[PDB]
Structure formats: structure tokens, C-alpha cells
Symmetry: D2
Subunit: 92 residues, 4 copies
């Protein structure tokens, strides 16, 4: 059931030029389902579409959709780590 749900989100995302709004805690709900899961079969499929959906959304935020209201915080954090210069100050 989770396998089919992530596919729909993936197939919806690949259809549109703009980033899609995801439910708050979309990825956290996937994580909580993972603790439940007891069958390697659906696990690899969930891992696959988790990877593919997130790869595509990162690409859209990087090059296609300047607007980022539909990025979840954990996705904006990845975009920021990619794009911004972070410098660490030490006592030395």
C-alpha cells in the first residue's frame, strides 16, 4: 500500500514543472512505516521510489522552481547545504 502511494506521488511530480505540495511529515510517515515493515519485498520498492521522488524534487528546486514554499524543511536543508557557503570558526 505504501509502495503504490509513493509511485503516485512520483508520477504526479514528474508531470508538472513546479514543485508539488507534500503533506507535512510526508517523509517522517515513510520512516515510521519502515519500522513497521517486516517484508524485504515492499522495503526495496519503498526505498526505490523514496530515492527517485527526492532526486527529482531536488532537481526541480535546483534548476526549475525558484519558489520553495512547497519544499519541506528537510528538503530546503539539503538545498541550502548544496548552495550556501558554510564556514566554521575555531579558536585555533
Amino acid at each position: 500500500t505504501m509502495y503504490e502511494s509513493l509511485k503516485n506521488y512520483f508520477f504526479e511530480e514528474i508531470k508538472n514543472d513546479k514543485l508539488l505540495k507534500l503533506p507535512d511529515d510526508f517523509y517522517d510517515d515513510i520512516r515510521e512505516y519502515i519500522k513497521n515493515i517486516k517484508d524485504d519485498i515492499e522495503l526495496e520498492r519503498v526505498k526505490y521510489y523514496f530515492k527517485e521522488l527526492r532526486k527529482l524534487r531536488i532537481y526541480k528546486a535546483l534548476y526549475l522552481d525558484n519558489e520553495r514554499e512547497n519544499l519541506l524543511p528537510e528538503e530546503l536543508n539539503i538545498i541550502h547545504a548544496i548552495e550556501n557557503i558554510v564556514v566554521e570558526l575555531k579558536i585555533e
Copy 2:
């Protein structure tokens, strides 16, 4: 001088299908130069080509170059955070 150097790395990266080998501590050296810098002019240019080079390399690792020997550790860490399911276990 740093402005022109990052451009060369950017223009070299956009030329080739595979990820390019970067010197160890390539980004850390950019960070240390930032502490030196005292002129907003070169700063924005360094920030721009830092962003653009890293965006492109992420894209190559995501979709173009399965091999990741030329990803620096901080870049592999971003790819991993994108692609892999991380679950946190709590006492609850």
C-alpha cells in the same frame, strides 16, 4: 584570483559527462579564503560559482555518473541524505 579559479572548475565540469576529480579540501580552501576576504565584490562572485559548480556536480552524481570516486566526502554526504532512508529510533 579565486573568482577566476572557480570559473575554470565550473567551465571544466560543464564540459564532461563524468564527475571531475577535485583536490582534497577544495571546498575547505574556499571557506578559508572567505575568512580572508574583505571586498563584497569578489565575495558574491565566489558565492555564485560555488553554488553553480556544486549544483551541477550534484546533478551529475544523481543522474549522470553512477561512479562516485570523484565525489568529495561532503558531496557524498549530500547525495546520501538525498537518496537514503534515515530512521531515528527513540525511547518513547
Copy 3:
């Protein structure tokens, strides 16, 4: 002026058994002041009391104050990384 302000927060924190409420963006405001600063003298002092205040608050959250309403999100994130088992799932 920032040097004296962090001291007060430090001397207030060492006085009480419970974690103190900090203003939202307390640390972010320190970061933004750092970009302003142009004098190594106050810089090392700000770095010192930044370190010492945060060390103490981590210790209080770890062993003294079970309540965490007064931890800022970036501090709770450090406590969580210390205390919780995080496992990364890969395709392999």
C-alpha cells in the same frame, strides 16, 4: 557589547538548576553579528562564551533538566544526535 551580553547569559545559566529560556534566534543573532565584526579582539571573546554557554546547556539537558521546552531547536538536534540511534538504510 556582544561580549558582555553573552557573559550575562552565561552567568545566569550557571546560577540555576534548570535550562533557561533563550530568545528565539539567540544563536542566529550571534552568527549575524559575527559577519559584522571587524576586530579579532571581541571575536575570540564571543567565540569563548558561545562555547562555554552551549557546553553548559548541553550538560544540563543531558543530566540535570529532563524538561526540554527551553532548548532551542538547534540544541535539541544536538541532544537527539547524542542520545538516539540513527540508522541509514541503503539499496546495497
Copy 4:
């Protein structure tokens, strides 16, 4: 068996003033065991002693042991996030 092993490391750590050397990938091995585990009973015990050992080692690095050769990289990263001022530069 993992339950008893973490206890020994915990009881050894509480005995000595200095940080103890841990095997490389000590925590990663605990993570890989977690994927194996199928019995909530040992799970909560492993989570408990994982928390307690790491809390104590953080405390030793913060206040007791200036030397950090025996901190594993993921522990040094937590110490650094506690102690050092990290500033993010944006295009704005």
C-alpha cells in the same frame, strides 16, 4: 549479547578519567545489529546503554579530556557542533 557488550564499554568508560579508545565503526556496528534485531526486549536495553555511553563520552570531551584522539569522527562532529560558531553565507 550486544546488551552485555555495551554495558562493559559503559562500565569501563565510567571508571577512567580519560576518553577510552573505541574500535573503528563501534557505533556503525551497533546500527547494523539494530537492523538484525527482532526482539523489543534487547532493543530498549541497547538503546539505553547507547545513550548513556555517548552522554558520558560527550561530557568527558567537553570538560575532562582535552585530548580527542579517542573520539570517533561522529563524536568529534558533535563536539564541534557544540563548541564552534558556524555561519552560513547566503546570496540575499
